[PDB]
Amino acid sequence: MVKQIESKTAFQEALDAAGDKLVVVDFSATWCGPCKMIKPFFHSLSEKYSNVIFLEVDVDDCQDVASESEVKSMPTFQFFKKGQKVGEFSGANKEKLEATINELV
């Protein structure tokens, strides 16, 4: 399962609720081709890695969250443990997404 994060407070709440679990956050947009490509793969990964938390943030809806997070490229994946950003990359690269999960869990 993927949770759509739709407020700043929700984002913090999710990071807090994760305990020590890896959290991966997909910053995306409805107009982004590469984002649309990888969305079903992000969802399949969420069903595979039961002990990793998968979040989605829409950058047009949540412009200030994205800005605060220093997002500059669509899509961006950020990785957190205990609220701390432990990794990040941009672009819709399936292998890199799953490799990074397997590097950081």
Total domains, how many?
1
| The CATH top-level class label | Alpha Beta
Measured by DSSP, the beta-strand proportion falls in: 25-35%
Using the 3D structure, state the CATH architecture: 3-Layer(aba) Sandwich
Quaternary structure classification: monomer
Q: Considering DSSP H and I runs of 4 or more, what fraction of the residues is helical?
A: 40-55%
Q: Report the span from N to C terminus.
A: 17 Å
Reading the helices and strands in chain order gives: EHEHEHEEH
Q: What is the overall number of helices? A: 4
Class computed from helices, strands and strand pairing: alpha/beta
Computed over alpha carbons, the radius of gyration is 12 Å
Modified residues (N6-acetyllysine): 3, 39, 94
Active site: 32 (nucleophile), 35 (nucleophile)
Protein name: Thioredoxin
Family: Belongs to the thioredoxin family.
Would you write up a description of this structure?
One of its GO terms (molecular function) is protein homodimerization activity. One of its GO terms (biological process) is response to nitric oxide. The modification N6-succinyllysine is found at residues 8, 94. InterPro entries: Thioredoxin, Thioredoxin-like_sf, Thioredoxin_CS, Thioredoxin_domain. This protein has 105 residues and is α/β, with parallel strands linked by helices. The chain has a single domain, classed as 3-Layer(aba) Sandwich (Glutaredoxin), CATH 3.40.30.10. It is built from four helices and five strands; from the N terminus they run E-H-E-H-E-H-E-E-H. The chain has helices at 8-17, 33-48, 63-68, 94-104; strands at residues 2-4, 23-28, 53-58, 76-81, 84-90. A five-stranded mixed β-sheet has the order 1-3-2-4-5. Strand 4 and strand 5 (84-90) form a beta hairpin. The protein is globular.
